[PDB]
Design a protein around this motif. Structure first.
Motif, PDB file in Angstrom:
ATOM      1  N   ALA A  85      65.079  12.463  43.730  1.00 46.54           N
ATOM      2  CA  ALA A  85      65.889  12.255  44.923  1.00 46.54           C
ATOM      3  C   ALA A  85      67.253  12.928  44.743  1.00 46.54           C
ATOM      4  O   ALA A  85      67.762  13.539  45.686  1.00 46.54           O
ATOM      5  CB  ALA A  85      66.086  10.772  45.196  1.00 46.54           C
ATOM      6  N   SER A  86      67.847  12.817  43.554  1.00 41.61           N
ATOM      7  CA  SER A  86      69.162  13.432  43.314  1.00 41.61           C
ATOM      8  C   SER A  86      69.115  14.932  43.572  1.00 41.61           C
ATOM      9  O   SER A  86      70.094  15.504  44.042  1.00 41.61           O
ATOM     10  CB  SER A  86      69.670  13.191  41.877  1.00 41.61           C
ATOM     11  OG  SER A  86      68.899  13.925  40.939  1.00 41.61           O
ATOM     12  N   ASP A  87      67.982  15.571  43.271  1.00 47.40           N
ATOM     13  CA  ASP A  87      67.832  17.014  43.508  1.00 47.40           C
ATOM     14  C   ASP A  87      68.083  17.329  44.988  1.00 47.40           C
ATOM     15  O   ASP A  87      68.798  18.276  45.355  1.00 47.40           O
ATOM     16  CB  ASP A  87      66.406  17.454  43.153  1.00 47.40           C
ATOM     17  CG  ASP A  87      66.159  17.466  41.673  1.00 47.40           C
ATOM     18  OD1 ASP A  87      64.997  17.639  41.257  1.00 47.40           O
ATOM     19  OD2 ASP A  87      67.134  17.298  40.917  1.00 47.40           O
ATOM     20  N   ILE A  88      67.478  16.523  45.847  1.00 47.30           N
ATOM     21  CA  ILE A  88      67.630  16.708  47.283  1.00 47.30           C
ATOM     22  C   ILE A  88      69.044  16.424  47.758  1.00 47.30           C
ATOM     23  O   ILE A  88      69.613  17.209  48.510  1.00 47.30           O
ATOM     24  CB  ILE A  88      66.597  15.820  48.008  1.00 47.30           C
ATOM     25  CG1 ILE A  88      65.197  16.366  47.696  1.00 47.30           C
ATOM     26  CG2 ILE A  88      66.845  15.802  49.512  1.00 47.30           C
ATOM     27  CD1 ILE A  88      64.040  15.423  48.058  1.00 47.30           C
ATOM     28  N   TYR A  89      69.620  15.306  47.323  1.00 49.69           N
ATOM     29  CA  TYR A  89      70.964  14.941  47.732  1.00 49.69           C
ATOM     30  C   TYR A  89      71.981  15.997  47.348  1.00 49.69           C
ATOM     31  O   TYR A  89      72.857  16.329  48.144  1.00 49.69           O
ATOM     32  CB  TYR A  89      71.373  13.603  47.097  1.00 49.69           C
ATOM     33  CG  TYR A  89      70.521  12.439  47.555  1.00 49.69           C
ATOM     34  CD1 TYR A  89      70.207  11.395  46.689  1.00 49.69           C
ATOM     35  CD2 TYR A  89      70.014  12.391  48.860  1.00 49.69           C
ATOM     36  CE1 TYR A  89      69.415  10.348  47.097  1.00 49.69           C
ATOM     37  CE2 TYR A  89      69.216  11.337  49.279  1.00 49.69           C
ATOM     38  CZ  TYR A  89      68.916  10.324  48.394  1.00 49.69           C
ATOM     39  OH  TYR A  89      68.086   9.304  48.779  1.00 49.69           O
ATOM     40  N   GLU A  90      71.888  16.496  46.109  1.00 51.14           N
ATOM     41  CA  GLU A  90      72.828  17.500  45.646  1.00 51.14           C
ATOM     42  C   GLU A  90      72.728  18.760  46.523  1.00 51.14           C
ATOM     43  O   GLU A  90      73.760  19.322  46.931  1.00 51.14           O
ATOM     44  CB  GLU A  90      72.555  17.843  44.171  1.00 51.14           C
ATOM     45  CG  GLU A  90      73.503  18.874  43.595  1.00 51.14           C
ATOM     46  CD  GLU A  90      74.870  18.307  43.259  1.00 51.14           C
ATOM     47  OE1 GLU A  90      75.039  17.070  43.297  1.00 51.14           O
ATOM     48  OE2 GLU A  90      75.774  19.114  42.937  1.00 51.14           O
ATOM     49  N   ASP A  91      71.511  19.195  46.826  1.00 54.34           N
ATOM     50  CA  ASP A  91      71.333  20.397  47.656  1.00 54.34           C
ATOM     51  C   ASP A  91      71.784  20.194  49.097  1.00 54.34           C
ATOM     52  O   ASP A  91      72.166  21.156  49.772  1.00 54.34           O
ATOM     53  CB  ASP A  91      69.868  20.861  47.694  1.00 54.34           C
ATOM     54  CG  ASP A  91      69.413  21.512  46.397  1.00 54.34           C
ATOM     55  OD1 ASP A  91      70.271  22.035  45.671  1.00 54.34           O
ATOM     56  OD2 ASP A  91      68.198  21.512  46.122  1.00 54.34           O
TER      57      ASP A  91
END
Ligand SMILES: CC(C)C[C@H](N)C(=O)O
Length: 344
Positions: A85-91
């Motif tokens: 999920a962090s991957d998506i939020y950061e992007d």
């Protein structure tokens, strides 16, 4: 003009106890913050999302939060759910403050929009190994884990620490999450004459292992991480839980200054004893301090890395990668009645 903030965690599934703690802390924090005027007059509104601590559902949730236009996320909880999920939020430029994910990798990838209000397993693991080496001094150790990111990460760290200290680790093995029969494992423990087991994983499995080991007459000493230190563990293992050693955050519910919060939660017939009640409450106070400065995720992250925030966990200070400086996991004796006391 209400400010929406996503509160994400395991609201259902085998490890729903974690989401119960998170939501309890989040609801009370929001009630308290709104009672004193919100942010510059604006109230916080919680938007609940269930990822069931499942990696696939976590991605579905992250994409939904993006679609819903929410810019601040308090969550997720499990490391294997929080990482993708962090991957998506950061992007997508969404701030994410996790009150429970402990795997070190989450903050080792250069991300700028992730912070935590809990510690790191690169500290929790060594803390357990040190205690085992200096205080327990067992003769024949076994390390077991559930093959999931959090548990196997901790198990390998403890294994490493014990190896460096020349301790005698007889075997290292993993079991499958969701399994209810551990007869083979207990038999191996008995055959091998194991006097100490470190288990890396969550309470559902740990509970079954404890109850089954005791039923078979084992006197083996067990130890687990903060994920097994909660009331559900006691519900499952009952008596078999007394004597369990655990590493976990300090008992924030017992610090005098937090009594008004404890009373408020008890008045609603909710339980204020779980660690995640406090790390989640602190996460909302951190977001609050940030929102008083800016509504832009990147600016909030920058502000939090440059300034401390006083919270129910005491003053919090973050390093450049979003981790708490000076956080410590303590060692405690866990009791069947669901409480924890400082280990000797
Ligand atoms: C809810 C907690 C037990 C989660 C655990 N610290 C993890 O990183 O998976």
């Amino acid at each position: 003009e209400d400010i929406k903030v996503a509160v994400v965690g395991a609201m259902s599934g085998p490890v729903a106890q974690y989401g119960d703690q998170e939501f309890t802390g989040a609801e009370q924090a929001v009630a308290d913050i709104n009672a004193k005027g919100g942010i510059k007059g604006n109230k916080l509104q919680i938007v609940k999302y269930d990822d069931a601590c499942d990696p696939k559902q976590a991605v579905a949730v992250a994409n939904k939060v993006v679609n819903d236009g929410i810019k601040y996320v308090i969550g997720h909880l499990c490391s294997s759910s929080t990482q993708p999920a962090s991957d998506i939020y950061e992007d997508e430029g969404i701030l994410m403050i996790t009150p429970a994910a402990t795997a070190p990798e989450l903050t080792a990838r250069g991300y700028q929009l992730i912070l935590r209000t809990t510690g790191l397993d690169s500290d929790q693991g060594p803390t357990a190994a040190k205690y085992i080496l200096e205080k327990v001094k067992p003769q024949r150790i076994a390390i077991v884990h559930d093959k999931q990111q959090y548990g196997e990460g901790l198990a390998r760290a403890v294994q490493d620490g014990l190896k460096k200290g020349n301790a005698n680790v007889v075997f290292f093995d993993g079991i499958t999450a969701g399994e209810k029969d551990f007869s083979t494992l207990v038999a191996r423990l008995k055959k091998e004459n194991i006097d100490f087991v470190y288990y890396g994983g969550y309470h559902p499995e740990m509970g079954q292992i404890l109850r089954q080991a005791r039923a078979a007459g084992l006197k083996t000493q067990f130890m687990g991480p903060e994920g097994v230190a909660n009331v559900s563990l006691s519900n499952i293992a009952g008596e078999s839980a007394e004597g369990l050693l655990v590493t976990k955050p300090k008992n924030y519910d017992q610090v005098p200054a937090n009594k008004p919060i404890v009373d408020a939660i008890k008045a609603k017939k909710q339980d204020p004893s779980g660690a995640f009640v406090w790390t989640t409450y602190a996460a909302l106070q951190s977001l609050q301090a940030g929102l008083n400065q800016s509504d832009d995720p990147a600016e909030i992250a920058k502000y939090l890395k440059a300034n401390s925030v006083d919270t129910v966990m005491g003053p919090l200070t973050w390093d450049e990668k979003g981790d708490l400086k000076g956080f410590e996991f303590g060692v405690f004796d866990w009791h069947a009645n669901g409480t924890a006391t400082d280990a000797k």
